[PDB]
Amino acid sequence: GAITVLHCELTAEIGVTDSIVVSSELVMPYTVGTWLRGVADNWSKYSWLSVRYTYIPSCPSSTAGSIHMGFQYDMADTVPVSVNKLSNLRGYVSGQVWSGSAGLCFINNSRCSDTSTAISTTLDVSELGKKWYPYKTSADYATAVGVDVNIATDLVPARLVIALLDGSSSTAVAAGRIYDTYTIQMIEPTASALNL
Amino acid sequence: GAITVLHCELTAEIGVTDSIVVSSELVMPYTVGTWLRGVADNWSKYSWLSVRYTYIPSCPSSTAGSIHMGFQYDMADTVPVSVNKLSNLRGYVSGQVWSGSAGLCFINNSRCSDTSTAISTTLDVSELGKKWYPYKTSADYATAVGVDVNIATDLVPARLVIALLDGSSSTAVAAGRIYDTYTIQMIEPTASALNL
Amino acid sequence: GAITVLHCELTAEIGVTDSIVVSSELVMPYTVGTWLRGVADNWSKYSWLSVRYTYIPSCPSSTAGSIHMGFQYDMADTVPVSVNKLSNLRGYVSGQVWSGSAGLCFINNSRCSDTSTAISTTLDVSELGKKWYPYKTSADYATAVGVDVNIATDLVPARLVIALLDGSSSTAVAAGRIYDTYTIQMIEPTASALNL
């Protein structure tokens, strides 16, 4: 009954400016990437076997700026407001917007050489609070969270906080992209139209 | 520690009309049936070890109509509106409203040889959200869900949806009944009067 | 590499009249059913590991009519025009429009003892033209075949022909439904929107 998918897809496009810009992505099928969003909808519940976010650069070596990533686990906790608080989170990694190429091996599965320079981080699936979560659409999530954020705890495993700053322009400059590489188990099918 | 009970009881009475009529039942002690609702209330939490719904006919071989059953696990998902949509659910099982007698052996657990025609489905007890669920009353559940449906995922493991159509009359004709056969582990006793 | 799915879903709804009515269904993801059509589109090619069509009744034991099924493999061959001609095909299977319930166990894969009466046929997955077929949409297929039918052999492995006759009314009476149970391997992911 468990049907397993392994895949790496574009999860977010990154631009860097001269000011801190904190953003976050829920670590659930619907938000992880559009491809998964579409396939996972045909199933009622899932379990993350492995989730790794890897940043791959697209800018010139002359591009100033740094990216910082880390995880949060209680949606009710406040999202880091400074890059300082961010550095306290689990899974913190911080790189420079033009580096990270060695991480490419995580995206195309070829054998990785030295990945100490890859700006990549992974989710601690075993310390998550439950193994089988329900597939949620961001819309429905939003509504729930609107009543009380604590309703999110039963619905989503974690949140990926990203921070970009130290750039040189007041206007966004294309830095790179964050790709997500996951192994997921999907169970109990459903027509997607009913999945909220 | 745990106190295990295996039992069978009437869970619902069924009637066929000439138009689709989808209905559902929460898979929790309180609603599985009267007897279980009663004994289960003396414990605080429980865990399903086995749950099986078996439809048994009571109409003549000439009764037009068909029955359909399946499970859903995110109380927030839309309930099916058609046989096609329903056929996708886990544990889907369809059949003539006058068929299904072979499932009798599941009820008074005897030797089941002829079970290829039994209109009986089983809950995937291991892929459920968690192990120990709290005993809830229809009333309390109802209120919670009235705030936000997602508050339900923390309380009920699944719901059985039932659809009946293909009947001959626009007014309901008696078809059969759905019986539930479960094995449940209960823990943390409480005076029933306190249990909501 | 490959991603394997085993699933069951409604594939077609059936009605009997008093005259032969041969119809057919391509044995490809897009037409096997709605759910598969949906998930299969996210992959470029696929391979059937198993395909089984099972007819399940919904009429009274007094309903006149019979159902017939079989497979054809050269889309260019003429489709049968009679039961005799049809009885020759591979996987031929005939039966009373009100019979067939024993095939339920194939649908929610249980222990199948009583399957001698199941009006269910299976595709000879190994003698198919090739292993990996491309995912095609009804639209695209249609156009290709409109140029020359033989363009189809490179795209679809087979078609299931269905014939219903021996009914009592000249106007269609609801008989039952055909469900499809498959196991399929999919490869070479693609955003579904690009898949024709």
Place this chain on the structure above:
Amino acid sequence: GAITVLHCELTAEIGVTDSIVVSSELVMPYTVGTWLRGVADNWSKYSWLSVRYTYIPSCPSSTAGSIHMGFQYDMADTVPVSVNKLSNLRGYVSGQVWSGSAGLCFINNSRCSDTSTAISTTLDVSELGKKWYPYKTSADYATAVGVDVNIATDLVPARLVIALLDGSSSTAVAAGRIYDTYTIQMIEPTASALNL
């Protein structure tokens, strides 16, 4: 040397009236059915390795009538005129005109568990007159037998007699069909046009 074929095809269509109607079919390639008649003609002689006639219903459970089958081996013997007389033949098998679905598994050779109700009989292929019989056409056979019936024993191994009665109408009602499942060895090729 020998070329072996195992196949199933429609052999005859059946109807019940309110009076006995005994009919018979020669157990030879030409008359077993259209398909075999066609391929068998390309060989000079043949040998039955297995021959099985299975009746499959297409009427409502409320159809009155019964079917009877048996084999005869001396074309000169008188054909039965009653059920009593017929019940004595080898391979006798009787049943309700609306019964017999369990024999489906013989047709598309699956696992036959429920075969106690199959109205299906088998030819005693080893006690036949000889092993290799010549392929004859109805026409040629007919003429020979018109001279003297005994000329038939050298050409046909047996004939299946079918009797239908106990119907409700004096005018024929559609009951079911008889299908033939054989395994045959053919030898000594010939252009079909020469084969009489």
Place this chain on the structure above:
Amino acid sequence: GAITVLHCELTAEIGVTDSIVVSSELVMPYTVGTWLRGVADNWSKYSWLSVRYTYIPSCPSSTAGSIHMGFQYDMADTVPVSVNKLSNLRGYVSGQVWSGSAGLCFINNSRCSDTSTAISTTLDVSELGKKWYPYKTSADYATAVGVDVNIATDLVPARLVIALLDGSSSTAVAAGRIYDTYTIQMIEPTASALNL
């Protein structure tokens, strides 16, 4: 389900003149010979296990002329226009119209002595592009090929090019015959009338 036939039959009659005459035969059941054409039609698809073309003489030792044979595999490629191009093809063999008698042993299966003088060539079944091809009638093939020859690739495995020349008469003189000796596997039966 695979039914196997082994047979040798006349495939083409040969006449020799004083000018090059190139001809070709599709290596498919329908064109290989009339006997096979007729039997193979009762099946939907086939696979060649072995195909060998052997020329047997019928003229006097005083008959001048030579026969040349070879294979082509992409129906879209141009048919050799000279005997030169022909000698480049796979399976090329060239003999003299009155010789080749030793090849008789391929036709009647008797043990062959020295066949170095037999004008015979065989098809490389393993390098064919697919194993199971659909049975096609030359008519339907023609139509397909009329739209675009490339449609032939999916339909036929190869083509046998034959060239006859060096004769002594402007008018054809009977030289010999080409017999085809094959082992074929036929699958998925069909009434022949539907086979195109």
Place this chain on the structure above:
Amino acid sequence: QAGISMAPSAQGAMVRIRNPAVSSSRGAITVLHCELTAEIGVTDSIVVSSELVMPYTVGTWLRGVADNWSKYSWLSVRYTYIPSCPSST
């Protein structure tokens, strides 16, 4: 030498038939022999001919010997063609 053939002007074959071999086992009596069975001639159009394979018609000697027994069974029957014309025919 492999692949080479030489058409002769005419082929020669000296037929010399030996004495029939007859012997009685227990119940069965067995004969072994050769007999000229048919004469052959060609034309420009096809001419089909047939010969029943039964003692009476297989050979003139066999015909008279086999007649002294009620039934028979063929252990082996072979027809061999020997030419009597040149390779120019």
